[PDB]
Amino acid sequence: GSSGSSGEKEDSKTRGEKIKSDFFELLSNHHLDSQSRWSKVKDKVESDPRYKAVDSSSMREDLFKQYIEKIAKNLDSSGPSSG
């Protein structure tokens, strides 16, 4: 991303932080797959009120794309992750 910021502030003026966390949670919960399609994830997440929280579209495509991008590419596997 481009927008930078230290730590995390939970103010009323801007409560995007929490909104961001919720977004990821949902997507991930939908067992995202490399062949993930925004149109699909959207038609599936739409049913959820959390998806309504995000007003800015850019955040949706960007965020969603970000997560998916990581999946497709070599997944971060390290530690006891493997059993």
Which single residue is written with the structure tokens 């599936």? Answer: 44
Domain 1-83, second-level architecture:
Orthogonal Bundle (1.10)
Under 8 Å between Cβ of 38 and 61: yes
Q: What is the largest CA-CA distance in the chain?
A: 45
Q: What distance in Å separates the CA atoms of residue 69 and residue 31, rounded to the nearest whole number?
A: 14
The residue numbers preceding gaps of C to N over 2.5 A in the chain are none
* Domain layout of the chain by residue ranges: 1-83
Under 8 Å between Cβ of 66 and 38: no
Radius of gyration of the chain (CA): 14
Under 8 Å between Cβ of 9 and 17: yes
| Method for this entry | NMR
Q: Which contacts (CB < 8 Å, 24+ apart) does range 15-19 have? A: 16/59, 19/53, 19/54
Q: Which contacts (CB < 8 Å, 24+ apart) does range 67-70 have? A: 67/24, 67/27, 67/28, 67/32, 68/32, 68/34, 68/36
